[PDB]
Amino acid sequence: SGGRATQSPGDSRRLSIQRAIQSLVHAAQCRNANCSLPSCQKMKRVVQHTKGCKRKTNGGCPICKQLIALAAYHAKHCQENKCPVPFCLNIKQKGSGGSGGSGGSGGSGGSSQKVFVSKVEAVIHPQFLADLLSPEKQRDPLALIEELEQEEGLTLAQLVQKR
Numbered sequence: 001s002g003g004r005a006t007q008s009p010g011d012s013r014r015l016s017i018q019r020a021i022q023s024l025v026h027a028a029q030c031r032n033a034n035c036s037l038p039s040c041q042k043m044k045r046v047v048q049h050t051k052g053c054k055r056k057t058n059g060g061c062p063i064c065k066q067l068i069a070l071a072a073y074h075a076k077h078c079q080e081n082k083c084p085v086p087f088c089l090n091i092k093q094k095g096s097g098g099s100g101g102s103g104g105s106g107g108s109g110g111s112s113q114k115v116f117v118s119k120v121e122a123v124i125h126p127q128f129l130a131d132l133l134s135p136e137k138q139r140d141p142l143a144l145i146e147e148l149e150q151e152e153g154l155t156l157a158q159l160v161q162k163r
């Protein structure tokens with residue numbers, strides 16, 4: 001009757017995905033000016049990126065990929081067709097798939113963004129997730145982002161060529 005979750009290194013970072021996803025939903029429908037929360041302000045930036053973006057799904061910007069990842073992962077745990085979450089909407093119209101995600105409640109995340117099924121999660125780069133969750137102020141996701149697209153050249157590409 002549900003359940004069935006194991007706390008892998010991935011789980012913890014998928015939980016950071018789900019946690020940034022919790023952020024996502026919030027900034028997606030936050031219209032309270034009195035609210036100036038850390039995860040909210042940083043995500044207000046990251047969300048506003050998703051809309052004012054052009055290289056969105058072209059694969060250039062890291063955000064929109066990890067945001068269609070968040071919004072998708074989120075969309076799996078979402079039952080709203082008229083959702084506030086941006087890419088959740090286009091998920092229901094384009095990104096069709098099953099349910100699931102993670103939920104083992106692990107806290108020992110690690111480099112597991114290769115072995116896993118990279119169907120949803122493109123360049124989520126949990127550091128970005130972590131920074132949203134961080135009470136710190138000048139710890140912006142979009143700052144990480146430009147860093148992330150730089151590091152998008154490293155790993156997976158590492159020793160990938162073969163015969």
Ligand SMILES: [Zn+2]
Pocket residue numbers: 026027030032035036037040
């Ligand atoms: Zn807010």
Ligand SMILES: [Zn+2]
Pocket residue numbers: 049050053054055056057061062063064065
């Ligand atoms: Zn973008």
Ligand SMILES: [Zn+2]
Pocket residue numbers: 074075078079080083084085088089
């Ligand atoms: Zn949604």
